[PDB]
């Protein structure tokens, strides 16, 4: 394998300085002997190249600096805490084949409609175009009942209000650079940083309500083979004790709702590329008595789905029922337009009450990758168990004894899980499991690069704090740089701000 003239010249151009030819460098390497070069180079270098070890004492760490500005607003794809469901009792027969008729039945089960009116207007949008949408959603339903042939899916007519709320004819026309060379305002896209936002208190309440138990079962699992090996027995015990406690958590309801919504939206985008298809939010659960229950949350109107890449944005209009007055927390509903659509009659222990029922209408957008990852929300469950047994197994390694039955059977609050003005709140294993599942669900729902950066940056700080608590004399080389890197990811995401507040609280309580 010889070297040609062109490659010989290329090699001669790829040598260190003071080497004329490749043969000379090869001969120099072949006859080299190490003679104190490293020590001489070390002596030659100045003393400024040093790596001091700064001690990490109990007063060195400081609380993180949250950004300031206007309060953050809700940015989820659907309502979580304020969602209201219209429920019907599906019997054993007539299996779920069409969701449109189920939505129609759920709408028919209500008899308290009224003339809608705007309660909380949208600031940056045309409010009436929203209202004219909602009435249309009603009208297009009635046109189903008089149709000679009952259709499977309903496509909304492209009216004036639907053309503005779905962002039609909004992109600039694509023209060649030659025909627009001399334009006084032809510039590239503005690559500006996101506006800073301040943490609000509604996200904490959302997380608190996410961990509570419900009255229905939201997850049903199949069967597996019989247990033979003792490891299989332990695994089955752990899985059963996790599932029986976590099946009724609201995070499971959120998982099912998100999975169904994302699957329906993706299927509609794939099928109806040029239709304003109407998609209702429908969930299924099992009652305590053992009967199916179908719940309806609202409607989604989807625009055009001419998607080429995986980052193209589909715009849709989401209307969701709720029983929460938007005027209590106006800053949470910045990107929402809220109407008043009915008066629900609640029967409780105090008797009969009448509560106005609103309708949160907003314009949102989604991408193909976001929809694909929303269909796999069930993996959160798969992660939550992984966050439990791997912990419990750790307690086995330090004890050389399977502590599976020594933790689930402990009928006493054993783990610090909450915060109260009185002090740190204690909870059992089930509360910890529900909290971990809720954390995984919220990570899935509020996924953003900021959260991924912040978690990775703060993992090192957590490890340093743990090492300090172990009397291992931790040391740092540049704490200010690490703190700046941590604080760089906190811009506007409420979930990351809540996580940073949690970290600050843990840092405060870990040195007392």
Partner 1 sequence: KNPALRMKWMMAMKYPITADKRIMEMIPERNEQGQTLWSKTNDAGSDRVMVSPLAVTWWNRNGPTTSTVHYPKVYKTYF
Partner 2 sequence: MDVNPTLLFLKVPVQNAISTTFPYTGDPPYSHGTGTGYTMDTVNRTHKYSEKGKWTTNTETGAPQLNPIDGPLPEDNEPSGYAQTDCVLEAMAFLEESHPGIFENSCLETMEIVQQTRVDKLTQGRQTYDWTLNRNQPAATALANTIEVFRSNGLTANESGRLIDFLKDVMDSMDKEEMEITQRLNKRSYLIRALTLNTMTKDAERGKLKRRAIATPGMQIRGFVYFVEALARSICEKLEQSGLPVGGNEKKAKLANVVRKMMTNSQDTELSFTITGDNTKWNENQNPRMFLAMITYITRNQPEWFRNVLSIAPIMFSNKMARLGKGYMFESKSMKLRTQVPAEMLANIDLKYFNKSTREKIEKIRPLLIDGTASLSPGMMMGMFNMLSTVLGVSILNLGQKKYTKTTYWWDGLQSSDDFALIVNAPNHEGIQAGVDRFYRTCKLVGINMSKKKSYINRTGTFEFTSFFYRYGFVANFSMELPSFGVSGINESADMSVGVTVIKNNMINNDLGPATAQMALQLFIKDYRYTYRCHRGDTQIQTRRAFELKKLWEQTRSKAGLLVSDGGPNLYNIRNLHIPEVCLKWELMDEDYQGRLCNPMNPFVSAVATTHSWIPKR
Partner RNA sequence: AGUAGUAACAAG
- Residues forming contacts to RNA in the complex (CB under 7 A) are 75, 124-125, 165-174, 188-195, 274, 304, 306, 311-313, 315, 335, 363-367, 370, 448-449, 492
Using the contact rule CB under 8 A, the part of the chain among 41-49, 79-87, 136-144, 486-494 near partner 1 is 136-144
The site for a copy of itself (CB under 8 A) is made up of 93-94, 105, 108-109, 148-152
Quick one: which H or E segment has residue 338? Answer: strand 337-348
Min dist CB 220 to a copy of itself, Å, is 22
CB atoms within 10 A of CB 479: 15
Min dist CB 247 to partner 1, Å, is 26
If you ran DSSP here, which 8-state letter would residue 355 be given? Answer: E
Q: Rounded distance, CA 416 to CA 424, Å? A: 7
Using the contact rule CB under 8 A, the part of the chain among 8-16, 138-146, 154-162, 246-254 near partner 1 is 138-146
Min dist CB 145 to partner 2, Å, is 8
Q: Ramachandran region of residue 373, left (φ > 0), alpha (ψ -120 to 50) or beta? A: alpha
Min dist CB 230 to RNA, Å, is 47
Q: Rounded distance, CA 100 to CA 281, Å? A: 10
Asked if 141 is part of the footprint of partner 1 (rule: CB under 8 A), the reply reads yes
Phi, psi dihedrals of residue 413, rounded to the nearest 5°: -65, 120
Question: Could you say which of RNA, partner 1, partner 2, none residue 323 binds, taking C-beta under 5 to 8 angstroms by partner kind?
Answer: none
Question: Could you say which of RNA, partner 2, partner 1, none residue 138 binds, taking C-beta under 5 to 8 angstroms by partner kind?
Answer: partner 1
Would you say 427 and 415 are in contact if contact means Cβ atoms under 8 Å apart? yes
Min dist CB 106 to a copy of itself, Å, is 9
x-marked contacts with partner 1 along 98-127 as a string, rule CB under 8 A: ---------------xxx------------
DSSP secondary structure, 217-279, as one string: B-------PPP-SHHHHHHHHHHHHHHHHHTTBHHHHHHHHHHHHHHHHHHHHHH-TTSEEEE
Q: Is 277 exposed, middle or buried (0-12, 13-18, 19+ CB in 10 A)?
A: buried
Asked if 209 is part of the footprint of partner 1 (rule: CB under 8 A), the reply reads no
Would you say 60 and 464 are in contact if contact means Cβ atoms under 8 Å apart? no
3-state secondary structure of 450: helix
Would you say 307 and 343 are in contact if contact means Cβ atoms under 8 Å apart? no
Q: Rounded distance, CA 223 to CA 424, Å? A: 40
Q: Rounded distance, CA 125 to CA 141, Å? A: 26
Q: Rule CB under 8 A: choose which of 209, 306, 372, 460 binds partner 1.
A: 372
Q: Rule CB under 8 A: choose which of 13, 35, 44, 146 binds partner 1.
A: 146
x-marked contacts with partner 1 along 429-468 as a string, rule CB under 8 A: ----------------------------------------
Question: Could you say which of RNA, partner 2, a copy of itself, none residue 150 binds, taking C-beta under 5 to 8 angstroms by partner kind?
Answer: a copy of itself
Question: Could you say which of partner 1, a copy of itself, RNA, none residue 270 binds, taking C-beta under 5 to 8 angstroms by partner kind?
Answer: partner 1
Residues in the chain: 512
Q: Rounded distance, CA 352 to CA 354, Å? A: 7
Min dist CB 131 to RNA, Å, is 14
Min dist CB 479 to partner 2, Å, is 9
Q: Rounded distance, CA 499 to CA 136, Å? A: 42
Q: Rounded distance, CA 197 to CA 495, Å? A: 12
Closer of 58 and 152 to a copy of itself (Cβ): 152
Q: Rule CB under 8 A: choose which of 156, 266, 317, 341 binds partner 1.
A: 266
Closer of 106 and 199 to RNA (Cβ): 199
Question: Could you say which of partner 2, RNA, partner 1, none residue 125 binds, taking C-beta under 5 to 8 angstroms by partner kind?
Answer: RNA
Closer of 93 and 181 to a copy of itself (Cβ): 93
Closer of 120 and 332 to partner 2 (Cβ): 332
Token pair in block for residue 173 = 């026309």
Would you say 474 and 468 are in contact if contact means Cβ atoms under 8 Å apart? yes
Closer of 259 and 510 to partner 1 (Cβ): 259
Asked if 309 is part of the footprint of partner 1 (rule: CB under 8 A), the reply reads no
Question: Could you say which of partner 2, RNA, partner 1, none residue 492 binds, taking C-beta under 5 to 8 angstroms by partner kind?
Answer: RNA
Asked if 173 is part of the footprint of partner 1 (rule: CB under 8 A), the reply reads no
Q: Rounded distance, CA 337 to CA 99, Å? A: 26
**Which three-class secondary structure string do you get for 403-449?**
CCHHHHCCCCCCEEEEECCCCEEEECHHHHHHHHHHHHHHHHHCCCH
Min dist CB 139 to a copy of itself, Å, is 20
Closer of 25 and 101 to a copy of itself (Cβ): 101
Question: Could you say which of RNA, partner 2, a copy of itself, none residue 169 binds, taking C-beta under 5 to 8 angstroms by partner kind?
Answer: RNA
Min dist CB 261 to RNA, Å, is 15
Distances (CA, A) of 277 to 81, 100, 361, 493: 27, 11, 17, 31
Radius of gyration (C-alpha) of the chain in whole angstroms: 30
Q: Rule CB under 8 A: choose which of 10, 231, 244, 270 binds partner 1.
A: 270
Asked if 148 is part of the footprint of partner 1 (rule: CB under 8 A), the reply reads no
**Which residues of the shown chain bind partner 1 in the complex (CB under 8 A)?**
113-115, 135, 138-142, 146, 266, 270, 372
């Amino acid at each position: 394998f010889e070297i040609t003239g062109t490659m010989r010249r290329l090699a001669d151009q790829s040598l260190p300085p003071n080497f004329s030819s490749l043969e000379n460098f090869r001969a120099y390497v072949d006859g080299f002997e190490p003679n104190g070069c490293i020590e001489g180079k070390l002596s030659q270098m100045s003393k400024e190249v040093n790596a001091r070890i700064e001690p990490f004492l109990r007063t060195t760490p400081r609380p993180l600096r949250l950004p300031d500005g206007p309060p953050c607003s809700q940015r989820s794809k659907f309502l979580l805490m304020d969602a209201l469901k219209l429920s019907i009792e599906d019997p054993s027969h007539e299996g779920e084949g069409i969701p449109l008729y189920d939505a129609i039945k759920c709408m028919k089960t209500f008899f308290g409609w009224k003339e809608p009116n705007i309660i909380k207007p949208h600031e940056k949008g045309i409010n009436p175009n929203y209202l004219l949408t909602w009435k249309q959603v009603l009208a297009e339903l009635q046109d189903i009942e008089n149709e000679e042939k009952i259709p499977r899916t309903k496509n909304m007519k492209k009216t004036s209000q639907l053309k503005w709320a779905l962002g039609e004819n909004m992109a600039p026309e694509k023209v060649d650079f030659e025909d627009c060379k001399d334009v006084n305002d032809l510039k590239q896209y503005d690559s500006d940083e996101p506006e800073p936002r301040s943490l609000a208190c509604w996200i904490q309440s959302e997380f608190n309500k996410a961990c509570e138990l419900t009255d229905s079962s939201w997850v049903e699992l199949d069967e597996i083979g019989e247990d033979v090996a003792p490891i299989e027995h332990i695994a089955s015990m752990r899985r059963n004790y996790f599932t029986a406690e976590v099946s009724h958590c609201r995070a499971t309801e959120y998982i099912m709702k998100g999975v169904y919504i994302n699957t329906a939206l993706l299927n509609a985008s794939c099928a109806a590329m040029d239709d304003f298809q109407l998609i209702p939010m429908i969930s299924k659960c099992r009652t305590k008595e053992g009967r199916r229950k179908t719940n309806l949350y609202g409607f989604i109107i989807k625009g055009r789905s001419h998607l080429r890449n995986d980052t193209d944005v589909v715009n849709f209009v989401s209307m969701e029922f709720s029983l929460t007055d938007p005027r209590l927390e106006p800053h949470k509903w910045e990107k929402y337009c809220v109407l008043e659509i009915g008066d629900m009659l609640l029967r409780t222990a105090v008797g009969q009450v009448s509560r106005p029922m609103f309708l949160y209408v907003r314009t949102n957008g989604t991408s193909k990758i976001k929809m694909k990852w929303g269909m796999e929300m069930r993996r959160c469950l798969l992660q939550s168990l992984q966050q439990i047994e791997s912990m419990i197994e750790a307690e086995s390694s330090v004890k050389e004894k399977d502590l599976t039955k020594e933790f689930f059977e402990n009928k006493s609050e054993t783990w610090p899980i909450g915060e109260s003005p009185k002090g740190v709140e204690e909870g059992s294993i089930g509360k910890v499991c529900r909290t971990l599942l809720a954390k995984s669900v919220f990570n899935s729902l509020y996924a953003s690069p900021q959260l991924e950066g912040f978690s990775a940056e703060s993992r090192k700080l957590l490890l340093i704090v743990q090492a300090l608590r172990d009397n291992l004399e931790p040391g740092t080389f540049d704490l200010e740089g690490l703190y700046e890197a941590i604080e760089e990811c906190l811009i506007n995401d409420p979930w990351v701000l809540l996580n940073a507040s949690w970290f600050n609280s843990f840092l405060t309580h870990a040195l007392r």
